[PDB]
Amino acid sequence: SLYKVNEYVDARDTNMGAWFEAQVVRVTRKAEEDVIYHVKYDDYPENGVVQMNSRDVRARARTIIKWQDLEVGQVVMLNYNPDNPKERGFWYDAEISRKRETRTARELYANVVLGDDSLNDCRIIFVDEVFKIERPGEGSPMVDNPMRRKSGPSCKHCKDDVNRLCRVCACHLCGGRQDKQLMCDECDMAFHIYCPPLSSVPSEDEWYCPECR
C-alpha cells in the first residue's frame, strides 16, 4: 500500500474533519488504494486501534511553511478552534484566502474545511505553525518518532505546564492529571471519580460537582 505498518501518519476524524497524529498498526484490504488502515492514535490510547478509510490517512506533516512563503490560494494544514476562534484548537485543511501585514499584526485568513461544510474567511491565529500537506508518492515516509504538534486548547492560567498545579484544567479539588475523569455541567470544571465514592461512570447524561447545584 501507500503507507506501511509502523509509519507515522495523520488520520482524519470524519466527524470533525480534523487530522490527528497517529501510527499505522496493521494494513488490510477490502476486495488499488481502497485499503483499510488500522491506526492507533499517539495520545489517545483509550480509543485503541481504529480503522481508517484510505482517503483519511496521509504521511505525517513535518514541514512548516513560513509566513513569507504563504500564498493565497494555497491549501495547507493549520490550527483552528471553531468553537473558540481566539484559542488553539485542532488541525484542519484550509485554503488560504487573504493576508494582511501591518505594523502590529500578521493577519492570516483561510477557508477551514470541517466535517461536511467549509467555514469561509477564518482568522487563523497560529501563523508560524502552518504545515505543508505531504503529497502522495512525493516525499519520504516518516519512520522515526517525530516531534509533537501542539493541540488545544490551552489553560491560560497554568499555561499547560504539563507538570504543575491546576485547579482549573485538572481536578478542581487537587489538579492531578491522575480515561475515567468526569465533569460538571454548570461550571464545566473537571472532577476525578473519587474526591464520597463511585463505581463505573453513571447512566444519567448530566452529572455534577457540588458548587453548581
Binding site: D13, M16, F90, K180, L182, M183, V201, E204, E206, W207
Partner: peptide, 10 residues
Amino acid sequence: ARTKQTARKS
C-alpha cells in the same frame, strides 16, 4: 456522563 476522555475533543 461527561468524561475528560470524551471532552478531550472540543
